[PDB]
Amino acid sequence: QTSKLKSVLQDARFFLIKSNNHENVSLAKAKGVWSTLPVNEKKLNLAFRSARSVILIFSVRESGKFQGFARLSSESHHGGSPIHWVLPAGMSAKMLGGVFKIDWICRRELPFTKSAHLTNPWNEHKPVKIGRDGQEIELECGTQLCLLFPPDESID
Template identity: 90%
Template sequence: GVWSTLPVNEKKLNAAFRSARSVILVFSVRESGKFQGFARLSSESHHGGSPIHWVLPAGMNAKMLGGVFKINWICRRELPFTKCVHLTNPWNDHKPVKIGRDGQEIEAGCGTQLCLLFSADDSIDLYQVIHKMRHKRRMHSQPKSGGRPSRREATRE
């Protein structure tokens, strides 16, 4: 699938994609009282592709969005907020995990617990998602060709 967000979140997500093995996005439609699923970010954002006809909330238009990310859905099942009232997010002042603006980061332990609350989604081929995740890990662990590492690569270790 594809997804887009505001430019301020786009920069954070691109940086996270470059530095982490996996970035998981948890989706919730405002005022729905539920999470609508979660997906793994599978690319940095890209600009200038074919136009996408987004379904957007009132008061928002496509010009407000940044580039387009590719995502791999892991679960497209809904999870009512009532099922996760016991989860608080340390990275949002220990507020309930259901509370957060677009782009709010969720601490890894809390995020894992949240994702485990979703019912399994039999319509998703998790083997493909895992294969893509492993492929990304191999790509990041192999040295880039072309001789000398860049300054950024040299300072990572």
């Protein structure tokens, strides 16, 4: 069975998160928080109240593989210092700082070959690895991704 995690997959909204470097994803799991473009933080903040739960799926541009997924624990923060994100070329911190708490359901990576049979109809019907940051994935599509993640038992 999928343990208590299944409780989210029955009604949660899934979101495709991208990153320009593996360092932002690695830093986000080391901090237990995340940040993204202000148009995406808005979609995640509004999805938080309208859904039973929100799930953020992590990915890197050059990797094409998923680095993990985590449940949005809270809305974006403000009035305090931001996280030390690794800003890629042409990026600036002014688009960030809306840092939100997240709960890592799995720290492990997952190659797209396991999810190759999946596609997002809430998009151009393209595979789950394509599409921009903040793209909303279908309820049952993103659910299936959570079922095909490997166990994090490699950590200990």
